[PDB]
Scaffold this active site. Structure first.
Site, PDB file in Angstrom:
ATOM      1  N   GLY A  58     -12.184 -29.372  13.997  1.00 36.45           N
ATOM      2  CA  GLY A  58     -11.109 -30.343  13.745  1.00 36.45           C
ATOM      3  C   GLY A  58     -10.819 -30.596  12.275  1.00 36.45           C
ATOM      4  O   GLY A  58     -11.515 -30.081  11.407  1.00 36.45           O
ATOM      5  N   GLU A  59      -9.776 -31.380  12.004  1.00 35.42           N
ATOM      6  CA  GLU A  59      -9.404 -31.753  10.637  1.00 35.42           C
ATOM      7  C   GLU A  59      -8.802 -33.162  10.546  1.00 35.42           C
ATOM      8  O   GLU A  59      -8.515 -33.795  11.555  1.00 35.42           O
ATOM      9  CB  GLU A  59      -8.428 -30.727  10.049  1.00 35.42           C
ATOM     10  CG  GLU A  59      -7.049 -30.707  10.717  1.00 35.42           C
ATOM     11  CD  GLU A  59      -6.275 -29.420  10.432  1.00 35.42           C
ATOM     12  OE1 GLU A  59      -6.693 -28.642   9.530  1.00 35.42           O
ATOM     13  OE2 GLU A  59      -5.251 -29.178  11.129  1.00 35.42           O
ATOM     14  N   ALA A  71      -6.665 -35.829   7.224  1.00 36.37           N
ATOM     15  CA  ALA A  71      -5.715 -35.795   6.106  1.00 36.37           C
ATOM     16  C   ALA A  71      -6.336 -35.208   4.854  1.00 36.37           C
ATOM     17  O   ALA A  71      -5.680 -34.440   4.145  1.00 36.37           O
ATOM     18  CB  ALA A  71      -5.166 -37.195   5.818  1.00 36.37           C
ATOM     19  N   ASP A 124      -6.551 -47.671  14.633  1.00 38.40           N
ATOM     20  CA  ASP A 124      -6.039 -46.329  14.906  1.00 38.40           C
ATOM     21  C   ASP A 124      -6.639 -45.738  16.203  1.00 38.40           C
ATOM     22  O   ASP A 124      -6.909 -44.525  16.303  1.00 38.40           O
ATOM     23  CB  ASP A 124      -6.318 -45.417  13.704  1.00 38.40           C
ATOM     24  CG  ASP A 124      -5.538 -44.109  13.757  1.00 38.40           C
ATOM     25  OD1 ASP A 124      -4.458 -44.056  14.405  1.00 38.40           O
ATOM     26  OD2 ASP A 124      -6.023 -43.127  13.152  1.00 38.40           O
TER      27      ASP A 124
HETATM   28  C1  LIG Z   1     -17.746 -36.740  14.867  1.00 43.74           C
HETATM   29  C2  LIG Z   1     -17.327 -35.729  15.903  1.00 43.74           C
HETATM   30  C3  LIG Z   1     -18.313 -35.221  16.737  1.00 43.74           C
HETATM   31  N1  LIG Z   1     -18.002 -34.319  17.662  1.00 43.74           N
HETATM   32  C4  LIG Z   1     -16.756 -33.906  17.800  1.00 43.74           C
HETATM   33  N2  LIG Z   1     -16.473 -32.993  18.788  1.00 43.74           N
HETATM   34  C5  LIG Z   1     -15.176 -32.542  19.087  1.00 43.74           C
HETATM   35  C6  LIG Z   1     -14.073 -33.401  19.133  1.00 43.74           C
HETATM   36  C7  LIG Z   1     -12.821 -32.896  19.440  1.00 43.74           C
HETATM   37  C8  LIG Z   1     -12.655 -31.542  19.723  1.00 43.74           C
HETATM   38  C9  LIG Z   1     -13.747 -30.687  19.700  1.00 43.74           C
HETATM   39  C10 LIG Z   1     -15.001 -31.191  19.384  1.00 43.74           C
HETATM   40 CL1  LIG Z   1     -16.380 -30.149  19.335  1.00 43.74          CL
HETATM   41  N3  LIG Z   1     -15.785 -34.370  17.037  1.00 43.74           N
HETATM   42  C11 LIG Z   1     -16.008 -35.255  16.065  1.00 43.74           C
HETATM   43  C12 LIG Z   1     -14.833 -35.732  15.294  1.00 43.74           C
HETATM   44  C13 LIG Z   1     -13.527 -35.595  15.728  1.00 43.74           C
HETATM   45  N4  LIG Z   1     -12.710 -36.169  14.815  1.00 43.74           N
HETATM   46  C14 LIG Z   1     -13.466 -36.671  13.785  1.00 43.74           C
HETATM   47  C15 LIG Z   1     -12.894 -37.368  12.635  1.00 43.74           C
HETATM   48  O1  LIG Z   1     -13.535 -38.258  12.092  1.00 43.74           O
HETATM   49  N5  LIG Z   1     -11.647 -37.050  12.220  1.00 43.74           N
HETATM   50  C16 LIG Z   1     -10.994 -37.762  11.103  1.00 43.74           C
HETATM   51  C17 LIG Z   1      -9.504 -37.865  11.455  1.00 43.74           C
HETATM   52  O2  LIG Z   1      -9.327 -38.244  12.827  1.00 43.74           O
HETATM   53  C18 LIG Z   1     -11.121 -37.088   9.755  1.00 43.74           C
HETATM   54  C19 LIG Z   1     -11.673 -35.821   9.638  1.00 43.74           C
HETATM   55  C20 LIG Z   1     -11.782 -35.236   8.389  1.00 43.74           C
HETATM   56  C21 LIG Z   1     -11.328 -35.908   7.263  1.00 43.74           C
HETATM   57  C22 LIG Z   1     -10.765 -37.171   7.368  1.00 43.74           C
HETATM   58  C23 LIG Z   1     -10.670 -37.758   8.621  1.00 43.74           C
HETATM   59  C24 LIG Z   1     -14.790 -36.435  14.066  1.00 43.74           C
END
Ligand SMILES: Cc1cnc(Nc2ccccc2Cl)nc1-c1c[nH]c(C(=O)N[C@H](CO)c2ccccc2)c1
Length: 335
Positions: A25-26, A28, A142
């Site tokens: 994932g990503e 901003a 959010d």
């Molecule tokens: C923390 C986390 C743990 N596991 C997963 N698994 C996952 C989720 C969706 C699809 C596939 C998988 Cl394996 N995801 C996460 C995670 C998902 N989003 C974020 C996150 O914090 N994203 C924010 C924006 O929503 C972000 C990311 C990078 C930089 C700034 C903000 C952590």
């Protein structure tokens, strides 16, 4: 020696402890990967952020870190570890290590039909976590499906506390107050939008732009009442809303013909235009639709409310950078 890791041309200097990176994932100002932890012998999630160029990103970054470090709840994502450069001159990136989840609600709704019991159960866990967040006197701000993480056994955790703030977005899930120029009730609105989406696998208010967002809302709720409008609304929004023709309210049972009428009753109370009349988190947990899962015995709250020592808005990004450096110091070898 192996050398620095890399994912899609982007460096991931997550030392020799974290290896076998895959894009997951990503955001901003960063990117999320999964990684093998050679100590705990599990795969984890690493969140790389690069906030330093923008004073707002630095603010969100510090705010997310302080809050997730403080919060301790099974329906909230935590921080297990933080990696960053040994010196402040070298710190251009921060890596936040977190429990790995299987997927998010965004993706699940994209390919799965949910049974009522699963809707019921997901709704319970969101609210339960939101109870803790709100008890801490914190707004997430959010809430949306892609910020709700799920594991193999349907366990749910709220993620992304970047927009999180001490009690006083994505267009489709933001309360009408926000757009009308706020309190805990904005999160309840988002949870409502999320319930509606679990019921039909499509967003209830997919506005193309902020104006189109307010149309979609009124397209279901009907034209606003006098009292509904009277809320220090901006001239633009009020005049436009007053200029529109009448819109009839669409009954929930017609928009969701096959939905549990209990689900619809709660849905109605969350998607209430006026935030003062909107159902609060505890009243939501206690709603008949959730009786099978409601357990006030096993729904913990924050020991004490959250507060910020310093006013983060006023601080220049070089002062903020220093604070992120210090906040993350405790994860540094030696220390
Ligand atoms: C923390 C986390 C743990 N596991 C997963 N698994 C996952 C989720 C969706 C699809 C596939 C998988 Cl394996 N995801 C996460 C995670 C998902 N989003 C974020 C996150 O914090 N994203 C924010 C924006 O929503 C972000 C990311 C990078 C930089 C700034 C903000 C952590």
């Amino acid at each position: 020696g192996a050398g620095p890791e890399m994912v899609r041309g982007q460096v991931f200097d997550v030392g020799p402890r974290y290896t076998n990176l895959s894009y997951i994932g990503e955001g901003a100002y960063g990117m999320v990967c999964s990684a093998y932890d050679n100590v705990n012998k599990v795969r984890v999630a690493i969140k790389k952020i690069s906030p330093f160029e923008h004073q707002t990103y630095c603010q969100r970054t510090l705010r997310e870190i302080k809050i997730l470090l403080r919060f301790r709840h099974e329906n909230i994502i935590g921080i297990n570890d933080i990696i960053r450069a040994p010196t402040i001159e070298q710190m251009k990136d921060v890596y936040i290590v977190q429990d790995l989840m299987e997927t998010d609600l965004y993706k699940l709704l994209k390919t799965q039909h949910l049974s009522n019991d699963h809707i019921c159960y997901f709704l319970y866990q969101i609210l339960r976590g939101l109870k803790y967040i709100h008890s801490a006197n914190v707004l997430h701000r959010d809430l949306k499906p892609s910020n709700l993480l799920l594991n193999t056994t349907c366990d749910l955790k709220i993620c992304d506390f970047g927009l999180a703030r001490v009690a006083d977005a994505t267009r489709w899930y933001r309360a009408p107050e926000i757009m009308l120029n706020y309190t805990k009730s904005i999160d309840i609105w988002s949870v409502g939008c999320i319930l509606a989406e679990m019921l039909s696998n499509r967003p209830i208010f997919p506005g193309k732009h902020y104006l189109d967002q307010l149309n979609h809302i009124l397209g279901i709720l009907g034209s606003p009442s006098q009292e509904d409008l009277n809320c220090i609304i901006n001239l633009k929004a009020r005049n436009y809303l007053l200029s529109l023709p009448h819109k009839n309210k669409v009954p929930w049972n017609r928009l969701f013909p096959n939905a549990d009428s209990k689900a619809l009753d709660l849905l109605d109370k969350m998607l209430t235009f006026n935030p003062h009349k909107r159902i609060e988190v505890e009243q939501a947990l206690a709603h008949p639709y959730l009786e099978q899962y409601y357990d006030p015995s096993d729904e913990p709250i924050a020991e004490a409310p959250f507060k910020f020592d310093m006013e983060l808005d006023d601080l220049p990004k070089e002062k903020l950078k220093e604070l992120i450096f210090e906040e993350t110091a405790r994860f540094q070898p030696g220390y």
